[PDB]
Structure formats: structure tokens, C-alpha cells
Amino acid sequence: GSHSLRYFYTAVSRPGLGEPRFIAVGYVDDTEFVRFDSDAENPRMEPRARWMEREGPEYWEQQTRIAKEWEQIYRVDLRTLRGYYNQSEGGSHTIQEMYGCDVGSDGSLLRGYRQDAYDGRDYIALNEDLKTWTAADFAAQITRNKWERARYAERLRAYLEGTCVEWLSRYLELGKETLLRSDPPEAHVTLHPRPEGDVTLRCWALGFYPADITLTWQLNGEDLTQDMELVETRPAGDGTFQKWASVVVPLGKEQNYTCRVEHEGLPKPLSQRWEPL
Amino acid sequence: AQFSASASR
Amino acid sequence: IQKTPQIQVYSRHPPENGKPNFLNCYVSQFHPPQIEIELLKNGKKIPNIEMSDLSFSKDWSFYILAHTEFTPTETDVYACRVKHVTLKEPKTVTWDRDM
């Protein structure tokens, strides 16, 4: 009941070597669909999902331009920010951005946004009202002042409320086969004995999609998350996701712990325990 | 489809 | 203003020495974006690794998945070598068929 379209831009300066490398990437939910990289042969916006080789040449030609347009914008921004903080020419620097829209399943825009980071630290961001900006320091304050004068916020807003939402919709259709398809988790539990005398129970969820999932180790029928170790969901490499959750348990109690895996692909949640054989 | 009416910092 | 990477070396499909599968090394949460990543068999890099293309998380952190085909054994161990401007230690990590 919620989807989104996001564009991520990045520019990294190359001291003494010419122009910054610039990359633009587009996502529909967590699926990359378009990508631009100035390190390329002939920098062009290219598709990154099968369902994108349908858009016409007019799409690629247009999107490639807007990308190249942004690339020049970031080439100069890098210089401006370097002036703002009085940095020298020997240092490499980064500028990142992320704009997009979240859209309910009833077609309503849930939230629009556009946020910056210079050298990994927040810089300026368009508030949720789509009208005012939040600036991290003075530099981003200089920028905020230019954008209020030019009423820039009003353009992003128009975009986010219209074009962003319309194209998110188009992209859903093009790729419903893969974007709106539920791929369930395979769940199993492993045992790794500790030298402390007790044991670590590990619960793994394999080959699932999307990626939103909840692993919960419970005892006797009650939750246990302030003391449950986790790994960040990792990509399996074939387009699925996987994750593990572990708790330390006392020897002889293994069987009193279950792992609940909740996921869109599962009709009812999974209850998985240790199974020595 | 990207936003095109950009502005500089 | 630099975040050190989080290496995760694993396998696509569960370990079972024969049924050939894949070797994944997932580096994430680093910054700056420039990072060096090579896979290792018993000490020498694997020739032609395939790597996804850079990307980054909402928190401005970069991530990337180095990988290549392979067939697990009993006497062979794989590791992930990685260099970063944050890596005090040119951190090699070994594939534990348990995490």
C-alpha cells in the first residue's frame, strides 16, 4: 500500500585530474531501473531492469540530457561549496542528493523530499511541507537564501506532486511482474556453541523479496529484541535478500526458543526452531 | 523521469 | 567525517562442497566512496571478479557487492581483501561458512 520513486546523484572531485565523476541512479522501491555514470564510454542514461528497454529513444535522449544537465550543475556546486568552506584544491570532496516521492496505493502522494549531504554530512533539505528548507550550517544557509529568492521550492513541489507521481505509476505497470511479485523466505536455525558454555542460536531468512522482513527470536511465546544480534540485510546476488538474527541461549533450553519470520510472501508467519537431527 | 528545473547551490 | 566499511563475506546458496554456487562480499556503510575490493583463494586474488556498481543508502553511506562463481571445499578458504581511506588495517576478512 506504498511505493516510491527516488533519484540519487553523487559527484566526487578528482584533484589535479580534471572533472568530477558524476553518477545518477534511479529506484522504484529498492530496484535500480536507470543509471548514469560519467566514467562511462559514452555517458548515457541506461536501463537497469528488463522492463525499461521499452521506453522509447525519446525517453533515453531526454533523460540523458537532464542527467548531463545535472552533471554540470554538480561540477559547479563542488566549486561553490569549496568556496563556502574555504577549502583548497588538493582535497577530494563529495556531494550527494536524494529526491523522490512516496505514493500510497490509492495514488496519493504520502511524502515528497529532496535532501543533500556534502562530504557525507547533511547540508540542505526540503521540508515535508514542500515549501521551506532545513539548512545544517552557514554554507547551506547561503544556498537556502538563494533558493528562497528564486522560489525554487515551488518547482520541486510541482514536480513531486505531479511528474514524480505519474512516472512512479508508469514504472509500476511496466514492471509489475518483478516489482509487485512476492518472493517468500526460506527459514532455518543453526547452533554455534560458545566457549562460555552456552550456545548461539542463529535464524536465517533466505531468498526473500522485497527486503522488508521481521525476524523475532521469542521465548515461551514472548518477544526478545533488546538483546538480539542482527546483520544488515544483504543481497544474495540473484535479486533476493537474506538476513540472520541470533540470541545467546543456555544449553538445554535450545528447544524453548522460536524464530518468527514475517514477510509479505508468507500467508502466515514462520515459526522456526533448532533441529539437531 | 527526473526533475529538470534545477538550480545551483 | 569518514565511516569505515562493514564487510560481510558469504555464499548465495548454503555451503555444500560440490554443488557449485557463488561467493559474495558485501561492503557497506563506508565513506568516502572510493574503496578497493578483491576476493582471495588461499592467499592470491581471484582474477576476474564481477562487482555491482556503486550505490548508497539514505544515510549517505556507500555499499557494493563484490562476487564471483566458485565451488567450496574442505581445504580451501576464501577471504575478502579491502582497502579504504578509513581502513587503518588493509582489512582482509575470511569467509566463515557460519555467518
Q: Which residues contact C13 (CB under 8 A, 6 or more apart)?
A: C19, C21, C22
Residues carrying CATH 2.60.40.10, chain A = 182-272
Give the whole-angstrom CA distance, residue B3 versus residue A158. Answer: 10
Give the whole-angstrom CA distance, residue A30 versus residue A26. Answer: 9
DSSP C5: P
Grid cell 578528482 — which residue? A14
Residues carrying CATH 3.30.500.10, chain A = 1-181
Give the whole-angstrom CA distance, residue B3 versus residue A266. Answer: 37
Q: Which residues contact A53 (CB under 8 A, 6 or more apart)?
A: A47
Q: Which of B1, B4, B8 sits opposite A77 (nearest CB)?
A: B8
Is A231–C53 a contact, with Cβ atoms under 8 angstroms apart?
Answer: no
The beta-strand segments (E) located in A131-222 are 133-135, 186-193, 199-208, 214-219
Give the whole-angstrom CA distance, residue A167 versus residue A113. Answer: 16
Residue A185: closest CA among A221, A118, A233, A231: A233
Give B-chain residues touching A152 at CB under 8 angstroms.
7
Give the whole-angstrom CA distance, residue A272 versus residue A199. Answer: 17
Bridge partner residues of C44 (DSSP): C41
Cβ–Cβ < 8 Å for C18, C7 = no
Bridge partner residues of A53 (DSSP): none
- The answer, for C24 touching chain A at a CB cutoff of 8 Å, is yes
Cβ–Cβ < 8 Å for A47, A25 = no
**Chains touching A by CB (3 or more pairs below 8 Å):** B, C
CB atoms < 10 A from the CB of C60, how many? 24
Phi, psi of A47 (to 5 degrees): -75, 155
- Asked if residue A210 has a cis previous peptide bond (ω within 30° of 0), the answer is yes
Radius of gyration for chain B, computed over Cα atoms and rounded to the nearest angstrom: 7
Per-residue burial over C21-57, b if 16 or more Cβ lie within 10 Å, else e, is bbbbbbbbbbbbbebebbbbeeeeebeeeeeeebbbe
Three-class DSSP category at A155: helix
Give A-chain residues touching C14 at CB under 8 angstroms.
206
Give the whole-angstrom CA distance, residue A120 versus residue A94. Answer: 7
Q: Which of A94, A192, A236 sits opposite C32 (nearest CB)?
A: A94
What strands, in cross-sheet order, belong to the sheet with A109-118?
A46-47, A31-37, A21-28, A2-12, A94-104, A109-118, A121-126, A133-135
Resolution in A: 2.3
Cβ–Cβ < 8 Å for C25, C55 = no
**A1-181 belongs to CATH 3.30.500.10:** yes
Bridge partner residues of C93 (DSSP): C80
Q: Please report the domains of chain C, with CATH numbers, ordered by start residue.
A: 1-99 (2.60.40.10)
> CATH second-level architecture of A182-272?
Sandwich (2.60)
Cβ–Cβ < 8 Å for C99, C15 = no
Q: Which residues contact A267 (CB under 8 A, 6 or more apart)?
A: none
